[PDB]
Amino acid sequence: PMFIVNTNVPRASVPDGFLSELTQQLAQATGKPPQYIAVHVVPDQLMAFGGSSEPCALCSLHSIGKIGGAQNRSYSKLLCGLLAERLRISPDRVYINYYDMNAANVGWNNSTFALEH
Amino acid sequence: PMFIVNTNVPRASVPDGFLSELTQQLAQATGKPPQYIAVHVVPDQLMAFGGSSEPCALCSLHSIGKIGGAQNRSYSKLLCGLLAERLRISPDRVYINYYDMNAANVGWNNSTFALEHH
Amino acid sequence: PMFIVNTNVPRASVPDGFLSELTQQLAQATGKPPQYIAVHVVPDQLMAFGGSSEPCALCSLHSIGKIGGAQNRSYSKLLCGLLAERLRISPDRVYINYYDMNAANVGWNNSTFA
Ligand SMILES: *[C@@H](c1ccccn1)c1ccc2cccnc2c1O
Ligand SMILES: *[C@@H](c1ccccn1)c1ccc2cccnc2c1O
Ligand SMILES: *[C@@H](c1ccccn1)c1ccc2cccnc2c1O
Numbered sequence: 001p002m003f004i005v006n007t008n009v010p011r012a013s014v015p016d017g018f019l020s021e022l023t024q025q026l027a028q029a030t031g032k033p034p035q036y037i038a039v040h041v042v043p044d045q046l047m048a049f050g051g052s053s054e055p056c057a058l059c060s061l062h063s064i065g066k067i068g069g070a071q072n073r074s075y076s077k078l079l080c081g082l083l084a085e086r087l088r089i090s091p092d093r094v095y096i097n098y099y100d101m102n103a104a105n106v107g108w109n110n111s112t113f114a115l116e117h
Numbered sequence: 118p119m120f121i122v123n124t125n126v127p128r129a130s131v132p133d134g135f136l137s138e139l140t141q142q143l144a145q146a147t148g149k150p151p152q153y154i155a156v157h158v159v160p161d162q163l164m165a166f167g168g169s170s171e172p173c174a175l176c177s178l179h180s181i182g183k184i185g186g187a188q189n190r191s192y193s194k195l196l197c198g199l200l201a202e203r204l205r206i207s208p209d210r211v212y213i214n215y216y217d218m219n220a221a222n223v224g225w226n227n228s229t230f231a232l233e234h235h
Numbered sequence: 236p237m238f239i240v241n242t243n244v245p246r247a248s249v250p251d252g253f254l255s256e257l258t259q260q261l262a263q264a265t266g267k268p269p270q271y272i273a274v275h276v277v278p279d280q281l282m283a284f285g286g287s288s289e290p291c292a293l294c295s296l297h298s299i300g301k302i303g304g305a306q307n308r309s310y311s312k313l314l315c316g317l318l319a320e321r322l323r324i325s326p327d328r329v330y331i332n333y334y335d336m337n338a339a340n341v342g343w344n345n346s347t348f349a
Contacts, residue, residue, distance in 0.1 A: 019283040035285040047157040048136040069221045076224035096224030104304045107311035107331030165254040167270040186339045193342030213342030
């Protein structure tokens with residue numbers, strides 16, 4: 001699993017511990033070992049939501065499996081909660097694109113996760 | 118709808134009201150209220166297009182529906198037009214990836230846009 | 236084809252020639268003319284991989300076709316090879332998302348490739 005957050009919130013406002021909290025919470029949420037989890041935070045972005053330059057975020061979560069209706073609503077509650085508490089971004093100014101990646105379409109360590117054929 | 122532009126054009130070359138213009142134009146183009154539209158511009162990027170570092174852009178438009186052959190051609194004419202006029206990027210050095218997102222796969226406001234089933 | 240690499244490796248550590256080597260190797264690997272190839276490198280990123288902030292990379296390759304099981308394994312060997320040699324990133328700290336794009340969903344020059 002990998003989570004990316006792009007935000008107009010200033011770098012200075014990103015608290016110590018943020019990447020590690022994302023990593024651990026996502027491991028728990030996805031039921032996957034933390035060794036697998038990648039996180040990427042991009043502050044100071046030139047972006048608008050609803051035409052307003054108030055704090056907002058555009059995010060993505062890629063996962064091989066564990067993507068779907070109820071699971072995604074749970075990820076959204078978790079991730080919006082963290083963005084609100086840690087970056088002071090209103091949940092209704094966040095978009096998260098979820099991608100259910102096929103194992104054959106994810107590269108890692110000189111190969112992919114399709115090892116069967 | 119959300120539109121992202123990554124470009125090697127300098128931050129100083131990005132017009133002041135550029136984000137607002139994109140928001141309004143995309144609202145009109147998508148038929149959606151501006152309150153839904155998100156825009157994101159990333160200048161000063163290290164990029165090459167065709168092996169050259171002349172001004173270029175790599176973009177994406179995500180939308181739940183309203184994505185398809187004819188519509189995408191219309192989006193491309195609109196968005197390339199804006200990038201050329203405002204950022205002075207030639208249309209043949211722009212790529213735009215279009216994504217038709219399922220409502221269940223777009224998160225917003227503590228949930229997603231799949232509110233119908235459990 | 237277009238390739239994006241986001242990494243926490245410092246800008247100064249990106250060698251002269253890197254974008255051009257990526258362009259050339261991707262042209263060769265995808266079979267597409269180098270005039271098509273777009274490459275984008277984003278250094279100095281705030282990232283963690285497995286909870287650690289040692290060098291890592293999150294990448295994507297979008298292509299109209301030329302995406303598939305064996306082809307993607309070959310792209311991964313090629314691209315991880317380059318990231319290891321040029322940016323000193325361990326291949327096991329790299330993820331690459333592959334996208335097989337429909338030509339109608341790729342805009343260019345005021346239109347699409349459909
Ligand atoms: C998460 C992930 C999904 C897509 C792109 C990057 N990361 C992830 C990472 C590693 C494995 C290994 C085996 C099975 N599943 C995953 C996975 O979902
Ligand atoms: C645009 C959009 C699509 C995908 C990801 C982010 N933004 C968008 C936003 C909100 C709604 C709500 C209801 C129906 N459609 C959309 C929509 O296309
Ligand atoms: C590579 C590509 C794929 C998706 C998005 C951006 N670039 C690429 C570029 C142009 C053409 C034209 C005709 C056929 N195929 C491609 C292509 O794979």
